[PDB]
Design a protein around this ligand. Structure first.
Ligand code: BTN
Ligand code: BTN
Lengths: 119, 119
């Protein structure tokens, strides 16, 4: 569940080794910072503002990749559900969409990210 | 350009006839309301809180379908870019990811919405 995190600072890591530390409030508001480490992508290592909402078994959150130190001219939004693991707490299983305004003006890619809890 | 919407509050319609009012602050933060009017979907005709972030010509925002009136046990997140139409106006081209929990566990649908500025 995501209500079972109300006012808790939680770090998570996905299969590409990106890390996010989200702050879920009482109401379900998510705030936090995301750190990208995915090979073949920009803005790796530095922290980016993250915001969205959690409720029950589902969550959605967003990161624009400008932090006033590296601008990738892009944005990522995740929608995902809670998958409980056999003694590994819960996971956030997601699909992302990354838009970028680069060379070919605008483009949009999609992929799967699975985020594992780290106490 | 999305930076040019700082301190504005603008209205947008997608092809499904869903609506969003989006408040953009000085530092690019997006807050506002989504009203789903998409056929064959739940949580229709009701206002849901949306948050996100805009910068240059990219935007990302999400909506959990739980406002404490109607809860469809789902969450959507959008990412995309500002396009200038030949028509003369401006759209937000986006990919969305709908996460929901159903008959046998968590699921994730995906699709494309194009949002049109109402003046
Ligand atoms: O390279 C960019 O334009 C900004 C960073 C993009 C990294 C993407 S976002 C989706 C995927 N999951 C991650 O953890 N990182 C990559
Ligand atoms: O049916 C649900 O579980 C909640 C409403 C989902 C509506 C989706 S969000 C993506 C797409 N774009 C819209 O404007 N409506 C649908």
């Amino acid at each position: 569940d995501f209500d079972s995190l109300s006012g808790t600072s939680t770090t998570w890591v996905n299969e590409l080794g990106s890390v996010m530390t989200i702050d879920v409030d009482r109401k379900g508001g998510v705030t936090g910072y995301y750190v990208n480490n995915a090979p073949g992508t920009g803005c790796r290592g530095l922290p980016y503002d993250l915001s969205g909402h959690a409720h029950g078994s589902t969550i959605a959150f967003s990161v624009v990749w400008s932090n006033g130190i590296a601008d990738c001219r892009s944005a990522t939004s995740w929608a995902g559900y809670a998958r409980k693991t056999f003694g590994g707490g819960v996971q956030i299983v997601t699909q992302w969409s990354l838009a970028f305004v680069g060379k070919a003006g605008g483009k949009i890619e999609t992929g799967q990210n699975v985020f594992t809890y780290q106490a």
